[PDB]
Amino acid sequence: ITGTSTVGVGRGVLGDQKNINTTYSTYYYLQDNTRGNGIFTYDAKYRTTLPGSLWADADNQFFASYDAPAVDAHYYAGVTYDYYKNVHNRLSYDGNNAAIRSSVHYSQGYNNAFWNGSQMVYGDGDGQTFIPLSGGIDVVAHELTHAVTDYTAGLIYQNESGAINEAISDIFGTLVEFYANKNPDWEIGEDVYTPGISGDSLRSMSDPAKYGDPDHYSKRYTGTQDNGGVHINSGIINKAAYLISQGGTHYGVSVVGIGRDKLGKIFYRALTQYLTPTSNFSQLRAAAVQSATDLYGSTSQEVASVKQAFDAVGVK
Ligand SMILES: [Ca+2]
Ligand SMILES: [Ca+2]
Ligand SMILES: [Ca+2]
Ligand SMILES: [Ca+2]
Ligand SMILES: [Zn+2]
């Protein structure tokens, strides 16, 4: 909407206060004009018709319980935008500052979040498996990263290409979490998963097997559930990424860690220059090796570590 840029204040899902960029025209709207062609947050009002209505507030204060998922979807989309622009010189998900749209309060008791081809969508959870999912910065960045993938490599959402798609979202979700630097870890969704259970998460990148996800190609799922295991087999690539960054010895194979920033550079280059809609795990290895070669040189530690990591997870 046309109006003037304003700064509201509110509390997120976890009870933390933050400032948000809003737009004033009669009401204060969750419309951040400071980033690209805007970040827009909508109320789906417990229904499934999208996007719903652009979030309107009378006083620019967002402290109601109902406001919390909107505050976080809006704010964490901003952090994710900043990560891609500042770290990778990428302007929004399409590289041309496309407007970023999110809807919260999607459906009832909805234990998921997704990119629908055009926008991000967040359930409130059922209060048992999840609380409102936009409360996780890794979750918000995971979702926006699906848009980045769709505009770039275009990895088909099934089987190996789909597991790569998933891992890319977990990897960048985690890198954005580290970028914001509030309780960062290599776990996925810990801030919004199972409020009655401390210390767990939806997935682990450091040890995918702790939740039954494979950490080696020999343990891959080849059935038809979950689009051929896209949220399961992602563990194999998540583990490789974790090893590249942090190092470790895994199934007897030692990997020299090169750190998060270089992991991000290598995978961003792979995603945007080398991967295609049908890339499989072996092709991802080749793309990562080539990306590291471009960035650091063929004789570099970075290239050697990429090879080590894929060796460790059984991907040749
Ligand atoms: Ca208000
Ligand atoms: Ca965390
Ligand atoms: Ca996390
Ligand atoms: Ca929990
Ligand atoms: Zn996903």
UniProtKB/Swiss-Prot annotation:
Gene Ontology, cellular component aspect: extracellular region
Gene from which this protein is expressed: npr
Function: Extracellular zinc metalloprotease.
GO MF annotation terms: metal ion binding; metalloendopeptidase activity
Binding site for Ca(2+) 2: 138, 177, 185, 187, 190
Enzyme class: hydrolase
EC number of this enzyme: 3.4.24.27
Cofactor note: Binds 4 Ca(2+) ions per subunit. Binds 1 zinc ion per subunit.
Name assigned to this protein: Thermolysin
Binding site for Ca(2+) 4: 193-194, 197, 200
GO biological process: proteolysis
Known catalytic reactions: Preferential cleavage: Xaa-|-Leu > Xaa-|-Phe
Thermal characteristics: Thermostable.
Positions bound to Zn(2+): 142, 146, 166
Family, as annotated: Belongs to the peptidase M4 family.
Record-listed Ca(2+) 3 binding positions: 177, 183, 185, 190
Binding-site residues for Ca(2+) 1, renumbered to this chain: 57, 59, 61
Location of the active site: 143, 231 (proton donor)
Keywords: Calcium, Hydrolase, Metal-binding, Metalloprotease, Protease, Secreted, Signal, Zinc, Zymogen
Record has Phosphoprotein as a keyword: no
Main localization (coarse): secreted
Keyword Hydrolase: yes
UniProt lineage: Bacteria, Bacillati, Bacillota, Bacilli, Bacillales
